[PDB]
Design a protein around this nucleic acid. Sequence first.
RNA 1: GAACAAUAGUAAGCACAAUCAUAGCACAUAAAAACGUUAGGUCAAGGUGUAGCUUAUGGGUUGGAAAGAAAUGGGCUACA
Lengths: 102, 138, 101, 99, 132, 194, 120
Amino acid sequence: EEVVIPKKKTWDKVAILQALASTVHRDSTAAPYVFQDDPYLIPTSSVESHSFLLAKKSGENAAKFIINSYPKYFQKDIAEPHIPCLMPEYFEPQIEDVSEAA
Amino acid sequence: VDVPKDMTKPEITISDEPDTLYKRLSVLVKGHDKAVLDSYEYFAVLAAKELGISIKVHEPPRKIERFTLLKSVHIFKKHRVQYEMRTLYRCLELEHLTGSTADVYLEYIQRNLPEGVAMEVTKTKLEQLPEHIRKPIW
Amino acid sequence: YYVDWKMLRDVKRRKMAYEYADERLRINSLRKNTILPKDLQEVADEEIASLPRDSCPVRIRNRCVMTSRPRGVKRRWRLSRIVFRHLADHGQLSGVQRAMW
Amino acid sequence: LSEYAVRMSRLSARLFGEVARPTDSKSMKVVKLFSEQPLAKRKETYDWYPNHNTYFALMGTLRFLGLYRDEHQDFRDEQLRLKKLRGKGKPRKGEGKRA
Amino acid sequence: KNRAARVRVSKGDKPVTYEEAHAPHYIAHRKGWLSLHTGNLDGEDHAAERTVEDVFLRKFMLGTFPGCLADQLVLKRRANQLEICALVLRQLPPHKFYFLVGYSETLLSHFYKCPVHLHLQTVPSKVVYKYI
Amino acid sequence: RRKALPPRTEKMAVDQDWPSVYPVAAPFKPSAVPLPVRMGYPVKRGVPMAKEGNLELLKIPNFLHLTPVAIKRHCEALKDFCTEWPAALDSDEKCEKHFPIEIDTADYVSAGPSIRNPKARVVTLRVKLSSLNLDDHAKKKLIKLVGDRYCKSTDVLTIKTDRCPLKRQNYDYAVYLLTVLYHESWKTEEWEKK
Amino acid sequence: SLWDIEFAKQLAAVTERPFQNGFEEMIQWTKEGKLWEFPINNEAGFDDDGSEFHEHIFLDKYLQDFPKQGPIRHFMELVTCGLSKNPYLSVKQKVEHIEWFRNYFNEKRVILKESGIQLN
RNA sequence: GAACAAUAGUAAGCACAAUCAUAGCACAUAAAAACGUUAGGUCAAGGUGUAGCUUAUGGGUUGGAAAGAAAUGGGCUACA
Ligand SMILES: [Mg+2]
Ligand SMILES: [Mg+2]
Ligand SMILES: [Mg+2]
Ligand SMILES: [Mg+2]
Ligand SMILES: [Mg+2]
Ligand SMILES: [Mg+2]
Ligand SMILES: [Mg+2]
Ligand SMILES: [Mg+2]
Ligand SMILES: [Mg+2]
Ligand SMILES: [Mg+2]
Ligand SMILES: [Mg+2]
Ligand SMILES: [Mg+2]
């Protein structure tokens, strides 16, 4: 009659992180987060800003190309949750003789 | 002057399930240096006082693990090199916690945990009695 | 390649021990007991002797990861006493410092 | 030691999941054989040595592709080139002893 | 004479860094550790894996950025994400620097099955602490 | 072509908010830090090195993203997620009589790709025998059934379960152990009369 | 359907943008699965095939195909007790050990008969 | 290359010292101890310049690597 049990609140795994993000707005004298904060790497013009992002994406794609071309160098998994996003992707079909499965 | 509007878009729902109750929450943070632990303790108590948790803080005794190795490469045992590993502990005690309050506190605690320290969390879950012990006769 | 032919043999020994771990455990369960009659214990001993030599966990040697030094290694870091000092004196290992007391 | 205490201990072991009937210490070893993981199955044992072949192959492939620059291998190649130019190279297999 | 992690004094004209100018017995007294992780605590485990990952990162980054690296890297391990801080001489164009950092951020992540952050600080030259 | 860009220090406003530039943990980039800080052992005729190119400042973990203003701003948004602790259990005396069962659960966090910790499966159960419906014979039988797991000075029964792989399985097994220990303490068999 | 994926990738291209804050970086990585689920639990991602404590502690239901009064029960109760207290093995893995014992005992029939004690 | 009631000595720097650690000082200990001497020890922690092996000085399996005529160094046990 005196014991009071409150109810629980269920939220998404990223809802609290979005609540944290809502507190901080965009800075005035700060470069966008994707570019390196070092002044020697801070872009000066719009063409330089586009070129730096394009070069970084080209390096990311080149690394992914090596990862896909040599899967055996990344087959060993150390992370317990087994995140599949970082696993190499296979371009070869599994079955070749069976027409239906090929 | 360019402040965005309507930036707060949370998704909070109140489930009908009773909230979990906790008696005592012990947080033992272990590290190598003392300045990092002191700053972390100040941050934790400042965060807890705003939420109204009445945090208790005390410093458990440190532990120093020492070992000895050969100084030279091939043959010199009279001369040795001794290495030391210090481990300092800080204990934060929380009392009268709820399931959601503990979760939201640990969210702001663990996300900002320093790289050079680790944390052990002990929870005293509160329950009244199981269903088979209320008033049974075999 | 690996550091040494000895390390290349040791990793094969560890792989074989991992492969034959369960079978050896099951056989030893039949040898380390007194409830079972002694007639089948001799057959179990023959079966465990018929196993490949590199299957027993007694052949593994805890060598250094970097230099494969058979002795003078620490189990916590799996490194020899010299590589450990070389890495610690550069400050590359957290919490490790010269003992002064 | 009484029959009542023996029965109490036997029932306590049964309810706690321990060994019910009395058994000898030498036969108790089989209990520990299964209660704990074997040495050969431990992660600190079967994953002691990292796969040096993977690291070496990946680094060599990156060096050949043009991403990693291995000073040690470059020095080895330079010394081998200089030795071969001097005149003492690697003999062909099958002719070192006979030819 | 002690010779571990000790640069011998020349006639008085060689440039040395702050980390190099301090003997290993000054660790935790005047200079800190180059890497931070929880594996070297008292009741923790998985220290050899962290050490081998750290040394592989050192050797990989040395070849990844040849001749432009100023000093030793800083490897911070904080909640499953690994931060790598480096000081690099401004010898390479930013176009190539962004290519290299984008390559590494994905290669190391896919190799160690964990998120990584890479931060570079450009310096005009190596910072001199003692006599130069 | 070489370019040298001045840092943000000349552009930082005096009253500009700090958490906007350091929202999360950062490697302490000197270009975005307007505070001139000298760290390092000074020379006999020199001064400690400045923030530019100083490895000492980069080695240490920076708390620039955890200033008190940022902490207050963050906790103002986090106040919406927590629930209010009931005031009916201000003192532990009422908590003992309302929720006599105590479940000690251990949680660990460590930096690295792995999450499994063998000490996470440990769940401890603490029950005060003064809050149960045990009779004299039931209490006397239960004390001897549990043995050393129950103390006389404090009169608190403790259950230490680690057999189950999962923490939830260990908790369920502890509850089952408590249930069977309570139930079988009331059954009197034929060997009790001797 | 291929057209559903074709329309979904167009939506994904518009929704995807370069990160402006580390908070957004962490949100996206957490949703993808790279970041740990806070608050961190050492059992996240592992469910042990959804088994409970009664699939681990209680294994006497697998000893039906054994002599009840013979030494086989005395031997197997110890291995069942060990498996129950073993947290490193799964319920299916213990089934393999007990089935291997069943197969071995039922295969070695001459020795158990010659031992002088009747066994099944 | 020096005379303090001063006669050619200024001197960055490395050493010494100070500081640091043995959770308060002081002491003590610990730590540190430059340039060089002993072509001192270590190709067998690891890589290595030079000179030598490639159906072998390379790579694998099995079985053996004793024993004490004798001398000596360092420790434990005692001779009460
Ligand atoms: Mg070698
Ligand atoms: Mg001078
Ligand atoms: Mg003192
Ligand atoms: Mg003194
Ligand atoms: Mg000394
Ligand atoms: Mg001194
Ligand atoms: Mg000599
Ligand atoms: Mg010699
Ligand atoms: Mg050699
Ligand atoms: Mg030799
Ligand atoms: Mg002798
Ligand atoms: Mg001696």
